């Protein structure tokens, strides 16, 4: 046989991670990389902005006097808002934003709420000049994966605009399998996994969650109910 | 929004065919479970194969035996199709003895009985002998994994033994099907069906269990971070 492999970690901040597993038996590199990639892109729980309410706008293709950006731009900026829930009981959260005067509206202008943490207060939301106003109501849920706005279409109020829900805290995953040798054997595998997240969960935590999900699903082949 | 444990259903045909159904699954998980299991089943399931052959008054594989229609190369090709089941997990190697005299149709059933060893295809044709032909064979069968060519292991018991390429995998074919299913309000859910054809030495359920164990052991490896 062959000895147990070595697992190596290289983390950049809490936003980038590289993971190296070597050596592996022939063909196991893709066998491990592909399901992990699918789970990472599909099944890691997270939070996302789901709905938005702005007054005096009837649809997403309108505009607000007093703000340089259109509705689409502020919605797109809201798509990158990262929110972390600290207690497991919290499910949905409503955030209110009040803005007046010539100012640079970021995330920290959101009013504080218990057991909700904003991870990017420096994210740019809007620009107001003199005499401009912005009152915003954003509904944030928790889910998994990517759900388009038309699929859920949940709008708290009659004027609320559904938003594409980027639930996945993982932004990107790539992986590469490279040939490696050990002693006389020369057909072994080395697996490299690169993960970019949004910061709510570190890449190592996301990888651990994906591995745990795969292990739980493998447990399912045990009891032949029928 | 956590999903309930899916139902696992088993259908079996003999010791050679198995269908294993898992339903319902989250969208996209059918491939995520089926493909690695298919790769492991086709790659890493241990089995048994003929690894060495010794024939009387035969010095090498490129010869003929008087009274025998087939030359040694064709006889070894026939012997590579022999399916041998080891009843004892601790057993590693066995040597089957065959002695025959013409005229007859020497099949796999003519091998002398051995304890804790079964021949799963006794009807497999081995040779044709005419009047005056004699066949004396010692066939060494081993446990192993994967495909090992004769030039690699080079196993010889006696001086005149002929090493034989060993294809240890007992699994013949693997397929899996992902079908549409749903559960109440959830839609676009997956139903996974694994179809396994083996040669009878290992049942499809046993191979599936070993594949699950291999995948779990390999998933275990992600638990010891090291700094670079």
């Amino acid at each position: 046989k062959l000895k147990a492999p070595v697992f190596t970690v290289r983390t950049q901040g809490r936003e980038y991670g590289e993971f190296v597993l070597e050596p592996l038996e022939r063909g196991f590199g893709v066998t491990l990389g592909n399901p992990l990639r699918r789970i990472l892109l599909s099944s890691i729980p997270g939070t996302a902005v789901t709905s938005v309410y702005i007054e005096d706008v009837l649809h997403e293709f309108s505009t607000i006097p007093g703000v340089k950006e259109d509705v689409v731009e502020i919605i797109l900026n809201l798509k990158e808002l990262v929110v972390r829930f600290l207690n497991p009981s919290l499910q949905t959260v409503t955030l209110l934003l009040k803005a007046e005067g010539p100012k640079e509206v970021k995330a920290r202008d959101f009013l504080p709420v218990a057991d909700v943490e904003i991870m990017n207060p420096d994210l740019h939301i809007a620009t107001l000049e003199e005499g401009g106003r912005l009152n915003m109501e954003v509904r944030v849920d928790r889910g998994v994966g990517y759900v388009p706005a038309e699929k859920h279409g949940i709008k708290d109020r009659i004027n609320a605009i559904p938003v594409d829900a980027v639930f996945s805290p993982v932004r990107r995953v790539a992986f590469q399998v490279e040939d490696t040798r050990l002693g006389q054997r020369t057909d072994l595998d080395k697996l490299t996994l690169r993960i970019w997240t949004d910061g709510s969960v570190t890449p190592l935590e996301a990888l651990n969650q994906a591995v745990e999900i795969l292990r739980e699903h493998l447990t399912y082949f045990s009891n032949p109910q029928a | 929004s956590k999903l309930k444990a899916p139902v696992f259903t088993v259908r079996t045909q003999g010791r050679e065919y198995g269908e294993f159904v898992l339903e319902p699954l989250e969208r996209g998980f059918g491939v995520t479970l089926g493909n690695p299991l298919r790769r492991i089943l086709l790659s890493s399931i241990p089995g048994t194969a003929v690894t060495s052959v010794y024939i009387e008054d035969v010095l090498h594989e490129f010869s003929t035996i008087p009274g025998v229609k087939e030359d040694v190369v064709e006889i070894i090709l026939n012997l590579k199709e022999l399916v041998v089941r080891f009843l004892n997990p601790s057993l590693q190697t066995v040597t089957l003895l065959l002695k025959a005299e013409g005229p007859k149709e020497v099949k796999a059933r003519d091998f002398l009985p051995v304890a804790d060893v079964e021949i799963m295809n006794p009807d497999l044709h081995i040779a044709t002998l005419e009047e005056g032909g004699r066949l004396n064979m010692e066939v060494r069968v081993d446990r192993g994994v994967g495909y090992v060519p004769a030039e690699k292991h080079g196993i010889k018991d006696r001086i005149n033994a002929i090493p034989v390429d060993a294809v240890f995998s007992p699994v013949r074919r693997v397929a899996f099907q992902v079908e549409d299913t749903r559960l109440g309000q959830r839609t676009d859910l997956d139903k996974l069906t694994l179809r396994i054809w083996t040669d009878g030495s290992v049942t499809p359920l046993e191979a599936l269990n070993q594949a699950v164990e291999i995948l779990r052991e390999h998933l275990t490896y992600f638990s010891n971070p090291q700094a670079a």
Binding site: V30 | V31, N35, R38
Partner: protein, 48 residues
């Protein structure tokens, strides 16, 4: 279907039986290397 991932190839693929032969040009008979060896009589150059 792709054996590495299990996902299908994005388009249908032409598949069928073909008759293929092995040619006598084999790499076993052609691979050759030399560090030093015999030399020619007159020119004292390596043989061919």
């Amino acid at each position: 279907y792709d054996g590495r991932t299990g996902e299908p190839i994005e388009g249908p693929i032409v598949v069928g039986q073909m008759f293929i032969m092995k040619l006598y040009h084999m790499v076993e008979d052609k691979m050759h290397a030399r560090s030093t060896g015999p030399y020619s009589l007159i020119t004292q150059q390596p043989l061919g």
